[PDB]
Specification:
By secondary structure, the protein is mainly alpha-helical. Helices cover 60% and strands 9% of the residues. α4 packs parallel to α6 and α6 runs antiparallel to α7. It binds 1-chloro-2-(methylsulfanyl)benzene. Keywords: Antimicrobial, Bacteriolytic enzyme, Cytolysis, Glycosidase, Host cell lysis by virus, Host cytoplasm, Hydrolase, Viral release from host cell.
Length: 161
């Protein structure tokens, strides 16, 4: 298990434009295209991302390439963020995957987790797990949030096996 396998489980793989759990146009392994309601706007973002005229459809290789870029962007965003980096650097490798997973899903802005971050940095795992669940995130995607929270609570891959 690694961050790629973990997010591939959580996001699935679809080769044609779809809507995510929030109703936003997406493709591949959870690659957000746009929050605009315009499918044409989403198709333009897709063509820009892939470098060719895609008509809303990509190959598996292209989906995996976008996915690698997206995971890397989440990691680099953590490392550039003065609030997130110290917490991330305090974690073991398995829990770092849970952190990347959250940033992939919600972005750096998706900021309100200050108290959870403090508990995680303090290694108060059960308390952090309780706090993480008091969130729109948990209520709207509870099965995925439960898996991520179990990963933070235990430092194991048990929720994904
Ligand atoms: C909200 S999860 C997270 C994100 C960035 C760095 C560390 C953590 Cl625990």
């Amino acid at each position: 298990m690694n961050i790629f396998e973990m997010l591939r489980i959580d996001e699935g793989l679809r080769l044609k434009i779809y809507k995510d759990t929030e109703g936003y146009y997406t493709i591949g392994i959870g690659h957000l295209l746009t929050k605009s309601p315009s499918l044409n706007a989403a198709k333009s973002e897709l063509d820009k991302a892939i470098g060719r005229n895609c008509n809303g459809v990509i190959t598996k290789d292209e989906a995996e390439k976008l996915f690698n870029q997206d995971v890397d962007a989440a990691v680099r965003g953590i490392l550039r963020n003065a609030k997130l980096k110290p917490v991330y650097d305090s974690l073991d490798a398995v829990r770092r995957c849970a952190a990347i997973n959250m940033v992939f899903q919600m972005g750096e802005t998706g900021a309100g987790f200050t108290n959870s971050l403090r508990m995680l940095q303090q290694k108060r795992w059960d308390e952090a797990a309780v706090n993480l669940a008091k969130s729109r995130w948990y209520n709207q995607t509870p099965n995925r949030a439960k898996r991520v929270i179990t990963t933070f609570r235990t430092g194991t891959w048990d929720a994904y096996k």
